[PDB]
Amino acid sequence: IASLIPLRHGCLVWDIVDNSGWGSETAFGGSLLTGLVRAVMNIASDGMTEGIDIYTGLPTYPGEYYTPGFLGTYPKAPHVVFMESPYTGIESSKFTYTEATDTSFVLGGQSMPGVNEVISAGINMGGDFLTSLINSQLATLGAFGGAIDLPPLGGIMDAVARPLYENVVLAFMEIPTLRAAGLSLPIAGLEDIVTGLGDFHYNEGWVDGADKAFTISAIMAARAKQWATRAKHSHEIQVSDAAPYIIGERGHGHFWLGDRVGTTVLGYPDPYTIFVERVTKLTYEWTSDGPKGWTITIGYKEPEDPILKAFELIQYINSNLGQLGI
Amino acid sequence: SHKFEFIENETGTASITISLDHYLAKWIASHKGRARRNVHVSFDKQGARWTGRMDHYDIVRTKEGDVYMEVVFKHDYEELKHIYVWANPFLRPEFQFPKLWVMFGPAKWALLLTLFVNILRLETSLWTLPDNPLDISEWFPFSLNPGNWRNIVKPFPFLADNSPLTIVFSRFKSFHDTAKNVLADSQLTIVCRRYFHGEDPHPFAELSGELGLPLIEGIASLIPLRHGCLVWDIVDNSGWGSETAFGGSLLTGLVRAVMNIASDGMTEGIDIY
Amino acid sequence: IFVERVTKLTYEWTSDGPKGWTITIGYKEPEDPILKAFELIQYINSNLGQLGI
């Protein structure tokens, strides 16, 4: 392999990894008493609703979990729990829950590809074939010098009509959702029950259109806005390395960046409940006093410094501003 | 602790800091325990009511050993940032003509009707519009059927609307972005109050007359509104175009005045009474 | 006497009792420059949404 596919020292090898088994088998929550609940997600035929199916069978494990010297997470079988029960080792933590906001998505601005063209073609054909039909069989214009052919009309009609039809037809979409009424959600304790927001909720949110995504697939563009507006939890924890858990890549640590890990929240009404989500950020710090340990973010969390939340909005703007220039 | 803020024509915010051993903090944390998952607050003091919806909550354990919950709420004004003014409310997204929503009238009528037609769309209504849709006499009996609605406009008589003539326009703006400049240039406040059964009077009740009889008898039976219905209104708290004061003195009192836009549209005259 | 409209009210309560009211009379810019920045970012996002249409 090294003689057939030579690679230089320093070559940056790119890969994509599936650390969220959501569409095959994983867990979204469980209990310290009885274990994690194995489940699957599927998108139903509208593209927006996700069904959760719960496995009734006894848990199985990937073959690496028998091998001598292995450590690490596969999303089929997450194992890590950060307990905030008595004798916890975590220095500090913040657990955040954000509710789902929006209940239907509005898209658009421009008509779908070909809709404006098909109308303009019809106006060109109608005006140019009408004076062709009139000049060929029916009539002429009596001018001072004799007869005159009526001009082709299709270009001037198309001109005067353009403000009245351009981006009128197939130019917007509304996509609905079951959020108000009831869904099962990939949150610990919401996987088997059905809960909705309630009769009182925020109604509409605009799907951003600067890269024209709705003209490739309006459902996919609304999937991205559904994801941005989902019910979510996150847990930020500060912890010292290698007891209980080693932090390191698969084969060397119990979990790494992107892996599904569980945790419990100190004052929570049901003390044994494990919330499961993926590690989104890891920070390590060392000083002349030794390690400060790891900052772990579990689930997706906004920058705590509000100035960094200002920079995050400005990055999204400069990307949208670039495509509006194209 | 608790904190709450009111802003003119913008989303105020509120927060509560609470012990995790409080039974209501346990109710906020247990999202299993709520079939209807959203959480709302009211703060009531001296006839004022701050109402809003929970955005998020934090359960925090500090290095020093303190454990607490912070709950954060956004004011009910935030509904207007999640309502879009369609180019034609009465047609499907697939066909939007005319391409701009455009209305000319008194500013309070032109804004409140632009909201009412999008509330009719959101409540899925099939009601035929009167010549004036904000006249209360058209809403009953068994006409508008508002009994199940989350949001409604306060109706009023058109011939009494003194608010300055203006243009409201949108092509799929939010209602906030639509109203922003109109409210600022007209000097108007939008206001919302949630109707609570068994403590508030009916939102549309008024006692106008010589004897002070109710103007419509049985109005709660004729125009039923659910508990928590958010009633929108626009109030003229700057009399700049009729009579008010811009300044004065503690010695001699405030100086009464009127403003008028001159025919170039830019310069305002001030006439002292 | 300078006359203007109340544009913001804020009330705060603690375990020590009430802290009273912050009243803003007339239209004042946010005191924290970060909130001045978040206000200009709201304005840009409203414009970007209309330029996309």
Binding site: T98, T101, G205, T229, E304 | - | -
Partner: peptide
């Protein structure tokens, strides 16, 4: 000192919600 900067950071985050939706 750091706790005072942390308190002011939390208050700014609560006030930024006037200007943002996630």
């Amino acid at each position: 000192v750091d706790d005072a900067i942390a308190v002011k950071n939390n208050e700014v985050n609560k006030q930024a919600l006037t200007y943002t939706r996630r």
